[PDB]
Structure 1
């Protein structure tokens, strides 16, 4: 069976990468929440 996760680095970065989060107000609030919680890996880029 084909499963749901079909990896692709390019699509991963374009969908959830740092520059994608930084391009909208809601993405920047995601980043702010993750910084406030203290996440070591802030997005999927790293």
Structure 2
């Protein structure tokens, strides 16, 4: 039974990585929101 999550570091970084968020303004707002909440992990860091 193949499950939904099939890990891949390259796909994870290129999809939800820090640079991916900064590319668009919506991603920048995502980072801004999580800085405000004080989350330790801003994004998925390798």
What TM-score does the superposition give when structure 1 sets the normalisation length? 0.97
What TM-score does the superposition give when structure 2 sets the normalisation length? 0.97
Q: Tell me, in whole angstroms, the C-alpha distance in 2 between the residues paired with 1:39 and 1:32.
A: 11
Structure 1 consecutive aligned stretches of length 4 or more whose deviation exceeds 2 Å = none
Segments of structure 1 that go 5 or more residues without pairing to the other structure are: none
Answer 1 or 2: which has greater helix percent: 2
CA RMSD of aligned residues (A): 0.8
* Equivalence for 1:29: 29
Q: Tell me, in whole angstroms, the C-alpha distance in 1 between the residues paired with 2:19 and 2:41.
A: 15
Residue 45 of structure 1: how far off its partner (Å): 1.3
Aligned residues: 46
